[PDB]
């Protein structure tokens, strides 16, 4: 087509779209000429870079700050060979429907920001190097669909351009950027609006489907205000994350030819484990950090302050961090009941400089007032929301309440928020960071000595700010778990307010994780797993969210039955006991075949090589958080696993699970819908009950 199909008859026009689904959207469209020959600079994707960017001084930063716009998307939209499009498709809030032209004015402001400072070169070089690396270190391709894709672009490109498709850029075109800046004008705009509220209002019907819309041209006073009246507000271009992206080299394995992470440094300040990548040899690194500190679970007020600290800390650093995250280094900050949770994942090239600035950043921390109020109110909503969630989460929350040492309820957390002031937190902050313990996982193609020097550097910076001193090795305590008095079957009830659903969790204390008990509990769990799939949903018809199985907490095993439904809880208990009878005789009716297919099922259930350094690193971290470190428990437990009999789990079954049982540790929790011994005070309940031991660290 030697001509665009939108020839000025339909420019500067709106549409009002009636959807079936209750969605609301805003659609800005620009038709633009062919730059397919201009694959050297690709300004349309450069505009897609600059529109959907979320960074310092960005448009969407203020649009969130104005609370009108959820998300946006923009960029070059292909059409025919001749014409191309430039679309912007935005989601709508309630009050987004009143400020439409304002929004568009801000878009214009952005265009004008590009019109003031003109084109940029270092942005093009930065995006050029980042897509050069992202093309170099691609991951995979589905064997079906790939071929249809590159065959889709096989028509348009010479045989050297079929793989370096758009993933490589030769030259710089400032005239094109001037051209598309001339294309981004209000003369060029095409508007469409989606809203359910367009009833009785759209007469002009679509030809094929039969939806209804309206031409409804924008008047000119709204138009003319955009062009000539142009000034700048709070918008500034985004900054760079260069950070020396050179060293992607793989490092060869040294004398430390361990297959599992070794503790390369232990002090009273920190504790450091290290593991070069043997199997994957990738140019990546993953880092996990625990900062242990006493002040975590001291009182509901300290917990709220820790929460808000990390929460607003995330809110502070997000605006700085997202453009570096855009470079291919993802992270997470979360909390523990014990301390803080730090994830650093990405390439090897610039994690030391980035993590350095992260520590320097979260060291020196400030508070805004209304920001504190919004986050405060927001978590306040999330807290008194907790009356209104799913009863399986309710059941797991009450189980982790009852079966730990100390536990602060969400009610206390609700009431205590009257006192969270800026000075009180601001007194709390240097006290917390003053004295703490570190624990870290370093895993990837890295060295031990540079890991020690960088880690040293980090904790030295920690001492540099607040004169950090290490913790004492007697206050690395953990909370123990309550020992049932060997016979008790206790129960109580909890009444939900919102959900007309009754959760229930049926806890069983087996034992600490010994090497026998892991395979006892896993194998017995699976032997009651698949016939439960046969009998519970189909035959007993309890509910749809019906779950059973292990419990891994504080180094203590457990057995559970998570069921949320709308039932009487004792009725539901009775059919659970019917399922217990079903599994009890289903033990004694086992053939050799059930046994053998089942243990092979467990085997393939357990056995798998890792598939990414983050997976194995997550399993190793998952072992460091339990402080067990049994790196080859896999092989031992499997080697043990084949050494079981039918009678091996019978003798496992009886003493804990039968009705005439001496070691029966049973306890349920009733969650009611909106309509043994009793437990009056859970403190006075937990008063005279013993505590379990801890695990000897190997």
């Amino acid at each position, epitope marked *: 087509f030697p001509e665009h199909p939108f020839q000025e008859e339909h420019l500067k026009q709106l549409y009002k779209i009636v959807p079936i689904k209750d969605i609301r959207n805003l659609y800005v469209t620009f038709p633009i000429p062919d730059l397919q020959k201009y694959y050297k600079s690709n300004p349309g994707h450069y505009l897609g870079h600059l529109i959907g960017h979320e960074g310092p001084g960005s448009l969407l930063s203020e649009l969130k700050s104005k609370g009108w716009v959820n998300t946006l998307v923009g960029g070059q939209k292909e059409g025919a060979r001749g014409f191309m499009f430039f679309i912007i498709n935005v989601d709508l809030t309630e009050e987004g429907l009143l400020h439409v032209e304002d929004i568009i004015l801000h878009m214009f402001q952005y265009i004008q920001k590009l019109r003031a400072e003109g084109p940029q070169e270092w942005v093009f070089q930065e995006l050029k190097d980042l897509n050069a690396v992202a093309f170099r270190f691609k991951d995979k391709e589905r064997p079906r669909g790939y071929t249809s894709k590159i065959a889709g672009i096989l028509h348009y490109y010479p045989l050297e351009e079929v793989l370096t498709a758009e993933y490589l850029l030769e030259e710089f075109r400032p005239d094109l950027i001037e051209m598309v800046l001339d294309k981004l004008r209000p003369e060029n705009v095409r508007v469409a609006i989606v809203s359910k509220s367009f009833e009785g209002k759209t007469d002009r019907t679509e030809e094929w489907y039969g939806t209804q819309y309206k031409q409804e041209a924008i008047p*000119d*006073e709204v138009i003319k205000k955009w062009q000539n009246a142009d000034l700048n507000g709070k918008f500034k271009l985004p900054t760079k994350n260069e950070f020396i992206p050179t060293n992607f080299e793989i490092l060869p394995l040294e004398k430390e030819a361990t297959p599992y992470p070794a503790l390369i440094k232990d002090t009273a300040m920190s504790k450091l484990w290290f593991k070069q990548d043997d199997k994957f040899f990738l140019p990546k690194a993953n880092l996990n950090f625990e900062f242990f500190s006493p002040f975590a679970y001291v009182d509901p007020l300290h917990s709220n302050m820790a929460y808000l600290y990390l929460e607003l800390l995330k809110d502070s650093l997000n605006e700085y961090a997202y453009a570096a995250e855009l470079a291919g280094l993802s992270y997470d900050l979360q909390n523990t009941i014990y301390g803080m949770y730090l994830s650093v994942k990405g390439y090897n090239d610039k994690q030391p400089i980035l993590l350095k600035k992260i520590i320097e950043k979260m060291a020196t921390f400030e508070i805004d007032e209304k920001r504190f109020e919004i986050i405060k109110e927001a978590y306040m909503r999330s807290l008194n929301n907790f009356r209104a969630e799913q009863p399986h989460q309710h059941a797991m929350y009450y189980l982790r309440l009852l079966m730990t040492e100390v536990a602060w309820t969400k009610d206390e957390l609700k009431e205590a928020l009257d006192d969270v002031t800026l000075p009180r937190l601001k007194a709390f902050i240097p006290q917390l960071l003053s004295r703490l313990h570190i624990e870290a996982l370093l895993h990837g193609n890295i060295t031990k000595q540079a890991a020690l020097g960088i880690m040293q550097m980090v904790e030295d910076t920690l001492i540099e700010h607040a004169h950090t001193k290490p913790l004492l090795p007697s206050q690395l305590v953990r909370y123990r778990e309550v020992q049932l008095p060997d016979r008790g079957w206790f129960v109580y009830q909890q009444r939900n307010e919102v959900h007309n659903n009754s959760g229930i969790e049926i806890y069983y204390q087996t034992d600490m994780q010994s090497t026998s008990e892991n395979m006892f509990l896993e194998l017995f769990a699976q032997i009651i797993s698949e016939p439960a799939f046969n009998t519970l949903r189909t035959k007993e018809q309890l509910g749809y969210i019906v779950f059973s199985g292990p419990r891994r907490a504080n180094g203590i095993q457990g057995l559970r039955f998570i069921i949320q439904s709308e039932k009487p809880p004792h009725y539901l208990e009775s059919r659970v006991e019917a399922f217990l009878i079903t599994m009890e005789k289903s033990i004694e009716d086992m053939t050799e075949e059930a046994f053998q297919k089942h243990i092979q099922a467990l085997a393939i259930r357990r056995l798998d090589k890792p598939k990414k350094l983050s997976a194995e690193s997550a399993k190793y971290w998952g072992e460091i958080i339990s402080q067990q470190y049994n790196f080859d428990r896999d092989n031992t437990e499997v080697a043990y696993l084949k050494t079981l009999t039918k009678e091996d789990i019978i003798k496992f079954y009886k003493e804990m699970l039968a009705v005439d049982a001496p070691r029966r540790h049973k306890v349920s929790v009733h969650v009611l819908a909106r309509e043994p011994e009793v437990i009056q005070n859970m403190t006075e309940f937990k008063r005279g009950l013993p505590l379990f031991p801890l695990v000897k660290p190997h």
Partner: antibody
Framework: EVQLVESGGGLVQPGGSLRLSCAASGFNISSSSIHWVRQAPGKGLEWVASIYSYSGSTYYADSVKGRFTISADTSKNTAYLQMNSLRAEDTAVYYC????????????WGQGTLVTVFN | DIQMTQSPSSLSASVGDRVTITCRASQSVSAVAWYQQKPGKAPKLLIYSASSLYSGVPSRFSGSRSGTDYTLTISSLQPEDFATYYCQQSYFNPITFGQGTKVEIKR
């Protein structure tokens, strides 16, 4: 060529909630659009509100944001303004007025009407 | 939200006098009107865009923009040109006015 017939503005007690008619004959509110203006007796002016009936775009002042609700019928080329939270400083004279194609050009007007929230 | 400094409150000059009235925005912006309204009557747009004359006004009126200084310029007064004035910045931002500029006579 321009006809701005605003009416319905009378006298009212606090706590009420009433509409605000304006008949914009001679042009379309889908074209260059109308505004509301707060002129108290013996005082200066103040732009109340503005609907864009082609897009439903409301815009309020800093003082009376939220408490007022403007609306627009394009089928009769006629806008309205529902009012809420009436206070004693609202004794004024209000005008419907056509803004035309200019940067600040609001040229035509109507006779106005007296809106009174009175002790 | 950018306010307006209406200067002066009022002034006095006779028929055939040169009257310059400076309103002043809170910020250095471009989008400013000028009005006239005799009491109990609808207003009139004297000067749109702070420099141009609206059609339907006698040609003894002009506007001028000087940076932030926004000036209504009256070349020659008339016996009917004694009325309340109003200057007006306009954006999508909420629109404020001045308190009124009254034109009185010299004697």
């Amino acid at each position: 060529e321009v006809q701005l017939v605003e009416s319905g503005g009378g006298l009212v007690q606090p706590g009420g909630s009433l509409r605000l008619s304006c008949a914009a004959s001679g042009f379309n509110i889908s074209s260059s659009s109308i505004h509301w203006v707060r002129q108290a007796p013996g005082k200066g002016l103040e732009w109340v509100a503005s609907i864009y009936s082609y897009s439903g775009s409301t815009y309020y002042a800093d003082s009376v944001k939220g408490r007022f609700t403007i609306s627009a019928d394009t089928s009769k080329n006629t806008a309205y303004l529902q009012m809420n939270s009436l206070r004693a400083e609202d004794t004024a004279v209000y005008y419907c007025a056509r803004h035309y194609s200019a940067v600040a050009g609001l040229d035509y007007w109507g006779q106005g009407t007296l809106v009174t929230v009175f002790n | 939200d950018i306010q307006m400094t209406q200067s002066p409150s009022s002034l006095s000059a006779s028929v055939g006098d040169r009257v310059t009235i400076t309103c002043r925005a809170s910020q250095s912006v471009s989008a400013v009107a000028w009005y006239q309204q005799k009491p109990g009557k609808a207003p009139k747009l004297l000067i749109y865009s702070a420099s141009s004359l609206y059609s339907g006004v006698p040609s003894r009126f002009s506007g001028s923009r000087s940076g932030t200084d926004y000036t209504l310029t009256i070349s020659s007064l008339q016996p009917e040109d004694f009325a309340t004035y109003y200057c007006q910045q306009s954006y999508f931002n909420p629109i404020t006015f001045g308190q009124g500029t009254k034109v009185e006579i010299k004697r």
